[PDB]
Amino acid sequence: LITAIPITQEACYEPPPQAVFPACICAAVLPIVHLMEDGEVREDGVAVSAVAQQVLWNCLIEDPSTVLRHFLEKLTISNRQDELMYMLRKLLLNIGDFPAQTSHILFNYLVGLIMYFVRTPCEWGMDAISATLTFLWEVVGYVEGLFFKDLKQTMKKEQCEVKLLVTASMPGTKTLVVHGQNECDIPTQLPVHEDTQFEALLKECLEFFNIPESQSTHYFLMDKRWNLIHYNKTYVRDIYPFRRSVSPQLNLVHMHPEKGQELIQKQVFTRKLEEVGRVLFLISLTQKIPTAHKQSHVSMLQEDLLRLPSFPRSAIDAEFSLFSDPQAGKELFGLDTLQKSLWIQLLEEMFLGMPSEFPWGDEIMLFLNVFNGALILHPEDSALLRQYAATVINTAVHFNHLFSLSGYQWILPTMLQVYSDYESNPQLRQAIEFACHQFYILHRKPFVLQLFASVAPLLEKGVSAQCLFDLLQSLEGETTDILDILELVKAEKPLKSLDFCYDLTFSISEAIKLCVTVVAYAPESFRSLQMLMVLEALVPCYLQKLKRQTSQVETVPAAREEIAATAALATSLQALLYSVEVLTRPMELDERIAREEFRRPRESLLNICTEFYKHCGPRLKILQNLAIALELLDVKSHMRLAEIAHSLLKLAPYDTQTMESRGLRRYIMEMLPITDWTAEAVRPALILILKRLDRMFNKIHKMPTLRRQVEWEPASNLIEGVCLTLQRQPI
Amino acid sequence: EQLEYTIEEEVAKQTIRMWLKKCLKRIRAKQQQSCSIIHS
Amino acid sequence: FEKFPNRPQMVKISKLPSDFTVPKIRESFMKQFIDRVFSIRARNLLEKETAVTKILRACTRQRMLSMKRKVQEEELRENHPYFDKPLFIVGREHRFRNFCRVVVRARFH
């Protein structure tokens, strides 16, 4: 760019000259800045704006400091930050560019101003720092040789580096010194750990100074030197990161509670604005670096971020107590939503910089959880919901290796919780359904398996089976991009499957067939327990959906799909029963754990099979009449269920909870009566159940010791089921 | 080079530390005298 | 190995009825997977704060608990059926292989 230098000031040979430009002429710059927007044209065609722009561009390229001196020095003596920052923003938005030297001088002057203000306490110090940081992120927009290592090293050497970057680690003050309301009174020195609220310090100071409880609300701690009124729930180490020999000096001041609350609101608002400014500054810094060095910069940023002691808390925690305040809560909430959005943007930008095969451990959560922290805070905001969905999709597409194996166990829990918790809001449900459909396109079956694993612990303050069924139903079809979530994703618009190995549409039945296999793979495992729970929660909803489909349309083809689906489900359950043969085997806190683990899978299997048969069996006759009954369950499957029930009875008398098992009682008194025992092949299953019942009652009768603590109402229901079976079929 | 630079600055400010020792010992009278006056 | 065509191992369970169509899914993923209308109450600030505190406590617990060549090696291992398995018959996860490794690598002012 030849036009970006003072041509005539560089060609001259270099073999002193003093410049006399008093400060009262530099004031003329502001009128020219205003004139840049004056469109009036002279009779000879010269426009005021063009001449002003040319003159100021030449001045800036020739000597930036001389023109931008009367403003930088003046701001120190007066609290006119707003006007000067407004003028600088107008300059930026009217010239449309800053040559390297001009932006360099401006950035150095602004950083030095921040350093001075933090250095020398003044009445309007923090406000000035906030105002300067609110604009620094634009000055950094045009700088060439700014690298993370040099900036970090130099600013740390200055040692007042915690006010510019967010990836700054500084051990805080160990002790704090505070004076009382009066003068010359015995002060107090108190310890400071790394997780101390100001509430505890206020309580200790209040009690130590013999103050009545009635006027407790009238006393607040504040820093006279910096003129700061402190919030109750802000960490000591965050406000005083400097670990110097001198501890910060506080004062316990008395004043009206309303004024104290107002001042606290103002100061927390300014501090939050400062934090937003710092985040924006880092965004701008990391959005202009040669692509070659971008990977190294992002790796360094990730390392420093990981090594920071309290980052997830810093980025997730919010001052909830102040939101309820009617006067100022709205503004704080509106500024916090922006802060959370910028944090999400920062993490997504950092993620894309790193390679696609980075070796991740569990610490990945520390980053991903941040997104969750935002989503919980306010998921009804469209601007945050669409941004979060887009960033998560970007992370999923950019991390093929991780997200294809175990990567959705961190995101899906909170998404499902919110999905279930905001049924009334159609927009949120539609957006989450679109996101889930996109994930299914991205990862196919593994995504579904990880979804089932993530939702199993929350199946019923939990996700109901109906919500999961609705989500799967939505996955069964196509969803429109109502918020245009795909606008922000960075990938080819076709969004073809990530793996070459996998054009099919998710179907519930298929999912069920997919689920049973897991149980077959490792029947004696916790994951098998989770899959069994998912099947128990899901299958009845599928049956109800089939019934509703039949109700909607009476044409025969609907019936044909119903028989086809019923046959497929019957085959799947038969395969599950055949492949779960391992569970047939029989048999203080550890004892309880063994008790429960033994219990859960067999009860789940009994519940699923009995519910399936009870719902279907009667339906078959009516549907066939509406339309050769096919055996839903083979004799071998019946034997498998009977043996499983026998194993449950084996332990039933010893433990009361097993005796009270809902699944066992349901199987005995609601599944035996319906199966047709006329075939000699199926009879041995019933003979086995009768043999165990007889042996159990003989054991009970043998010694009264067991009779003392045995519960008989379950046995009464058991005998009721037995005689009901006898009544249903006299054979 | 960094080590020697740090040592130079450290020794300079250590001489300043001795200067402070003297000056603070001199100034440690007025504030406590005012404390006694306030108590009295 | 790169010249030969890709053919990843897939999940297969023999002891199922012939009518069951086993779903198509990678074996390594399965192995690592198994190795490990009123909403007014929810939008109240107190429950939201409780949830955020739970997330913060989980992050604190995680804190307390706490290249291309290797990636290519693992990619090749997953890619081809016979990789790292000497003589095609020894078995990469066989007890005899472990015994040989321990005996050979046994090592001891």
- Write the secondary structure of chain B as one string of H (helix), E (strand) and C (coil): CHHHHHHHHHHHHHHHHHHHHHHHHHHCCHHHHHHHHHHC
Strands A249-254 and A219-223: antiparallel
Mutation target among B9, B30, B38 for the A interface, most CBs of A within 10 A: B38
- Find the length of chain A: 731
Is residue A584 within 8 A of residue A523, CB to CB? The reply is no
DSSP A500: T
- In terms of CA atoms, which chain B residue is nearest residue A157? B6
The two tokens of residue A495 are 């969004």
Resolution of the experimental structure, in angstroms = 3.5
Q: Give the span between the Cα atoms of A219 and A181, in whole angstroms.
A: 9
Is residue C48 within 8 A of residue A552, CB to CB? The reply is no
Contact call for C and A: 3+ CB–CB distances under 8 Å: yes
Q: Residues of C with CB below 8 A from A313's CB?
A: 56, 59-60
Taking the mean position of all CA atoms in its chain, how far away is CA C78?
11
The two tokens of residue A464 are 């109901």
Name every residue whose Cβ is closer than 8 Å to that of residue A137 and which is 6 or more positions away in sequence: A277, A280, A281, A283, A284
Q: Give the span between the Cα atoms of A451 and A364, in whole angstroms.
A: 18
Which of C16, C37, C49 lies at the smallest CB-CB distance from A423? Answer: C37
Q: Which of these, A325, A339, A442, lies nearest to A389 by C-alpha position?
A: A442
Is residue C42 within 8 A of residue A421, CB to CB? The reply is yes
Strands A188-191 and A175-179: antiparallel
Q: Give the span between the Cα atoms of A437 and A373, in whole angstroms.
A: 23
- Find the length of chain B: 40
Strand partners, A223: A228
Integer CA distances (angstroms), A74 to A23, A71, A139, in order = 10, 5, 20
Q: Residues of A with CB below 8 A from B34's CB?
A: 184
Phi-psi sector, A120: left (phi>0), alpha (psi -120 to 50), beta:
beta
Q: Residues of C with CB below 8 A from A569's CB?
A: none
Q: Give the span between the Cα atoms of A176 and A192, in whole angstroms.
A: 7
Q: Which of these, A95, A394, A155, lies nearest to A281 by C-alpha position?
A: A155
Mutation target among A153, A184, A185 for the B interface, most CBs of B within 10 A: A184
Is residue A287 within 8 A of residue A353, CB to CB? The reply is no
Name every residue whose Cβ is closer than 8 Å to that of residue A551 and which is 6 or more positions away in sequence: none
- In terms of CA atoms, which chain B residue is nearest residue A182? B38
Q: Does A177 touch chain C (CB under 8 A)?
A: no
What is the residue whose two structure tokens read 């029947």?
A523
Contact: C11, A521; criterion CB under 8 Å: yes
CA distance C108 to chain A (A): 32
- In terms of CA atoms, which chain A residue is nearest residue B39? A184
Q: Which of these, C82, C73, C68, C5, lies nearest to A500 by C-alpha position?
A: C5
Q: Give the span between the Cα atoms of A670 and A721, in whole angstroms.
A: 7
Contact: B34, A183; criterion CB under 8 Å: no
Helix (H) or strand (E) holding A402: helix A400-403
Is residue A455 within 8 A of residue A463, CB to CB? The reply is yes
Q: Does A522 touch chain C (CB under 8 A)?
A: yes
Strand partners, A222: A229, A251
Q: Give the span between the Cα atoms of A543 and A611, in whole angstroms.
A: 10
Alpha helices in A553-626 (DSSP H): 556-579, 589-626
**Position B20, amino acid:** L
Q: Which of these, A311, A297, A410, lies nearest to A350 by C-alpha position?
A: A297
CA distance B35 to chain A (A): 6
Question: Under DSSP, is residue A190 helix (H, G, I), strand (E, B) or coil?
Answer: strand
Q: Up-side HSE of residue A704: CA atoms within 13 Å toward CB?
A: 0
Q: Give the span between the Cα atoms of B22 and A637, in whole angstroms.
A: 96
- In terms of CA atoms, which chain A residue is nearest residue B36? A184
Q: Which of these, A130, A215, A157, A226, lies nearest to A181 by C-alpha position?
A: A215
The two tokens of residue C95 are 């007890």
Is residue A187 within 8 A of residue A179, CB to CB? The reply is yes
Strand partners, A695: none
DSSP A247: P
Is residue A499 within 8 A of residue A404, CB to CB? The reply is yes
Q: Residues of A with CB below 8 A from B39's CB?
A: 184
Q: Give the span between the Cα atoms of A57 and A523, in whole angstroms.
A: 76
Q: Give the span between the Cα atoms of A184 and A587, in whole angstroms.
A: 77
Task: Strands of C1-109 (E only): list them.
Answer: none
Question: Under DSSP, is residue A254 helix (H, G, I), strand (E, B) or coil?
Answer: strand
**Position A664, amino acid:** L
Is residue A177 within 8 A of residue A133, CB to CB? The reply is no
Q: Give the span between the Cα atoms of A584 and A647, in whole angstroms.
A: 6
Contact: A183, B38; criterion CB under 8 Å: yes
Interface subset of C 36-65, CB within 8 angstroms of A? 36-39, 42-43, 45, 48-49, 51-52, 55-56, 58-60, 62-63, 65
- Find the length of chain C: 109
Taking the mean position of all CA atoms in its chain, how far away is CA A347?
12
CA distance A184 to chain B (A): 6
What is the residue whose two structure tokens read 């001795």?
B18
- In terms of CA atoms, which chain C residue is nearest residue A371? C55
Is residue A679 within 8 A of residue A731, CB to CB? The reply is no
Q: φ and ψ at A489, to 5 degrees?
A: -75, 140
Torsion angle of C-alpha atoms A61, A63, A67, A72, degrees rounded to 10: 110
Taking the mean position of all CA atoms in its chain, how far away is CA A625?
53
Chain A touching partners, 3 or more CB pairs below 8 A? B, C
**Position A133, amino acid:** L
Contact: B39, A184; criterion CB under 8 Å: yes
The two tokens of residue A497 are 């499957």
Give the per-residue SS3 of C56-71.
HHHHHHHHHHCCHHHH
Q: Give the span between the Cα atoms of A1 and A78, in whole angstroms.
A: 38
Is residue A690 within 8 A of residue A649, CB to CB? The reply is no
Is residue A605 within 8 A of residue A645, CB to CB? The reply is no
CA distance A185 to chain B (A): 9
Q: Does C34 touch chain A (CB under 8 A)?
A: yes
Q: Give the span between the Cα atoms of A342 and A346, in whole angstroms.
A: 6
Strands A228-229 and A175-179: unpaired
Q: Give the span between the Cα atoms of A286 and A307, in whole angstroms.
A: 19
Name every residue whose Cβ is closer than 8 Å to that of residue C29 and which is 6 or more positions away in sequence: A404, A405, A446
Which of A313, A357, A377 lies at the smallest CB-CB distance from C71? Answer: A357
Helix (H) or strand (E) holding A452: helix A445-455
Name every residue whose Cβ is closer than 8 Å to that of residue A170 and which is 6 or more positions away in sequence: A161, A162, A241, A242, A243
Is residue A507 within 8 A of residue A580, CB to CB? The reply is no
Name every residue whose Cβ is closer than 8 Å to that of residue A446 and which is 6 or more positions away in sequence: A404, A405, C25, C26, C29, C33
